[PDB]
Design a binder for this molecule. Structure first.
Ligand SMILES: Cc1cc2nc3c(=O)[nH]c(=O)nc-3n(C[C@H](O)[C@H](O)[C@H](O)COP(=O)(O)OP(=O)(O)OC[C@H]3O[C@@H](n4cnc5c(N)ncnc54)[C@H](O)[C@@H]3O)c2cc1C
Ligand SMILES: C=C(O[C@H]1[C@H](O)[C@@H](CO)O[C@H](OP(=O)(O)OP(=O)(O)OC[C@H]2O[C@@H](n3ccc(=O)[nH]c3=O)[C@H](O)[C@@H]2O)[C@@H]1NC(C)=O)C(=O)O
Length: 266
């Protein structure tokens, strides 16, 4: 008896764009088994997604209920918000998540995208990962999941359902000091409607800095704009269409051989 309803994904992504989808809110292991009986996608916090104006035809699964419960010293549900865990770890005097401050991910999305900063990446903070695939749950170590930059290699159709974190006791004031350095490093970034960095960095470089140097900050298509604050942030000024965002992406790609970090749906 899980909740299934048609929604507009613009309401479920940090960028605030996206057409219609059938949303399945899964609260239990058995409900997950049912929801995955037909073609599906998994939605986390929608912070790395560019959803097109037509939306998607597959069941869109969100993990709630038991998947939002957590114990820092035990299992942590994949539907739990990473920003919550970052603060909870500091409160508990547990170190290991400080380098993940400022990433508005669900745990599952952070695993899929190996979310990280120069200070640490999600793969570093994992001891074990429960993954649902082929109708069953299995437990993996992070070394089995093919992690790289902004990358994982989960089993096909794999849904991350729960993790065990790799944390270490540290004085609370020291954890907070490490977090303050991450905050300082992120000062140049906007906190508006965005899906973070649109483009991946070429290995030697910052895509943001390259966009900046090419003078592309401030360029606009409808309500989609290359941020004046950070060149790699495309922001939604109100009612941008995905069409407008895509057009802006193509405008950048005409000038610079950059690849998207965003996942595009469909
Ligand atoms: C302001 C802002 C700042 C950001 N800063 C950073 C940063 O510093 N570093 C960084 O790496 N990223 C950053 N991001 C990008 C983004 O937060 C990450 O890619 C993050 O890991 C996405 O997680 P999510 O839960 O929002 O996933 P979503 O956007 O919902 O989904 C992304 C992908 O993960 C999949 N997915 C989601 N949940 C699961 C699951 N349970 N099991 C299997 N697959 C799943 C989706 O199907 C999709 O393929 C930022 C984004 C914003 C908006
Ligand atoms: C925000 C994301 O990740 C971010 C992550 O938060 C930060 C912190 O480690 O470093 C990466 O950005 P980045 O390479 O642009 O790092 P920043 O520190 O923001 O910028 C690097 C340098 O470029 C300069 N800067 C940045 C933007 C700009 O328009 N102009 C410019 O001159 C900054 O002043 C800084 O000296 C990540 N992007 C990738 C692809 O790795 C995301 O993935 O969505």
């Amino acid at each position: 008896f899980m909740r299934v309803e048609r929604v507009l994904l613009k309401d479920y992504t940090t960028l605030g764009v996206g057409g219609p989808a059938e949303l399945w809110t899964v609260e239990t292991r058995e409900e997950l088994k049912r929801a995955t009986e037909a073609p599906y996608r998994v939605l986390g916090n929608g912070s790395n997604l560019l959803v097109l104006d037509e939306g998607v035809p597959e069941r869109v699964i969100r993990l709630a209920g038991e998947f939002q419960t957590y114990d820092l010293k035990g299992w942590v549900g994949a539907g739990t918000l990473l920003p919550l865990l970052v603060q909870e770890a500091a409160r508990a005097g547990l170190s290991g998540l400080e380098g993940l401050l400022g990433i508005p991910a669900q745990v599952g999305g952070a695993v899929k995208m190996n979310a990280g900063t120069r200070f640490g990446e999600m793969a570093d903070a994992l001891e074990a990962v429960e993954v649902f695939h082929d109708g069953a749950f299995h437990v993996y170590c992070p070394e089995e999941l093919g992690f790289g930059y902004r990358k994982s290699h989960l089993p096909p159709g794999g849904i991350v359902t729960r993790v065990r974190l790799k944390l270490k006791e540290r004085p609370k004031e020291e954890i907070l000091r490490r977090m303050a350095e991450v905050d300082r490093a992120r000062k140049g970034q906007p906190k508006r409607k965005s899906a973070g960095c649109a483009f991946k960095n070429p290995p030697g470089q910052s895509a943001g800095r390259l966009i900046d140097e090419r003078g592309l900050k401030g360029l606009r298509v409808g309500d989609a704009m290359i941020s004046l604050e950070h060149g790699n942030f495309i922001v939604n000024l109100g009612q941008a269409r995905a069409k407008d965002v895509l057009e802006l992406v193509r405008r950048v790609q005409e000038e610079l051989p950059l690849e998207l970090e965003w996942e595009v749906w469909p």
